[PDB]
Design a protein around this ligand. Structure first.
Ligand SMILES: OC[C@H]1O[C@H](OC[C@H]2O[C@@H](O[C@H]3[C@H](O)[C@H](O)[C@H](O[C@H]4[C@H](O)[C@H](O)[C@H](O[C@H]5[C@H](O)[C@H](O)[C@H](O)O[C@@H]5CO)O[C@@H]4CO)O[C@@H]3CO[C@H]3O[C@H](CO)[C@H](O)[C@H](O)[C@H]3O)[C@@H](O)[C@@H](O)[C@@H]2O[C@@H]2O[C@H](CO)[C@@H](O)[C@H](O)[C@@H]2O)[C@H](O)[C@@H](O)[C@H]1O
Ligand SMILES: [Ca+2]
Length: 174
């Protein structure tokens, strides 16, 4: 199977951010503002201001966007950036959901320990970098993608950034 990029969001300006919403939390909170554009990170990125208590293994904040072709797609990728503050501990368990249907995709497929992470630099500041790649079946009726940013005993009050959201569909008529 060969795939082509069907949709991509790189967060070029605040105008893209209006397409994203806060779809809720579980054992975690957003700060205020909850979601905003950031023009330094990723040359434009989605900034989630989070408060993860670090007490349990599933501390989730979620953001969502409508994607017209979602029902045609089978691969999602995106990046997560967290400032490289020293001494952070815990694991990320990021995933996604297709809706309607609350179809959970990628559960525990992209888990990462923050104490051994790749780094990327933006404006001379370092960020831990986590890539998320999720394969799923074409799912009838889905119109919304929810990205779930999940901490597991990751005590953190600060910004987490999403960038480079990519959706792929099969090509060649197959
Ligand atoms: O309403 C339909 C739907 O409702 C519930 O699902 C939706 C809610 O999901 C919550 O998040 C879930 C995750 O989706 C996922 O299921 C996760 O599972 C992990 C589990 O907690 C644990 O950490 C586990 O440890 C494993 C591990 O992962 C490995 O596999 C390892 O090898 O082994 C270890 C140990 O075995 O891993 C699991 C992942 O692989 O759990 C979380 C938290 O779920 C708790 O809370 C739920 C709340 O509804 C429910 O009570 C669940 O039973 C319980 O465990 C959240 O995202 C929550 O927000 C979702 O609710 C939706 O929210 C939106 C906004 O309000 C609404 O629109 C929806 O109506 C709904 O409320 C349920 O799980 C489903 O079965 C289904 O019934
Ligand atoms: Ca970007």
């Amino acid at each position: 199977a060969r795939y082509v990029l069907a949709e991509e969001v790189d967060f070029s300006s605040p105008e893209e951010v209006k397409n994203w919403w806060n779809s809720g939390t579980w054992q975690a909170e957003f700060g205020s503002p909850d979601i905003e554009w950031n023009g330094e990170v990723g040359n434009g990125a989605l900034q989630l201001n989070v408060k993860l208590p670090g007490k349990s293994d599933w501390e989730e904040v979620r953001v969502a966007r409508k994607f017209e072709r979602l029902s045609e797609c089978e691969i999602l990728e995106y990046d997560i950036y967290i400032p490289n503050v020293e001494g952070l501990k815990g694991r990320l368990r990021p995933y996604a959901v297709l809706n309607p249907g609350w179809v959970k995709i990628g559960l525990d497929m992209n888990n990462a320990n923050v104490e051994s992470a790749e780094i990327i630099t933006f404006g001379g500041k370092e960020y831990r970098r986590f890539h998320v790649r999720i394969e799923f079946d074409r799912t009838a009726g889905v119109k919304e993608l929810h990205i779930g940013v999940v901490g597991d005993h990751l005590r953190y009050d600060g910004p987490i950034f999403i960038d480079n959201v990519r959706l792929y569909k099969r090509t060649g008529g197959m």
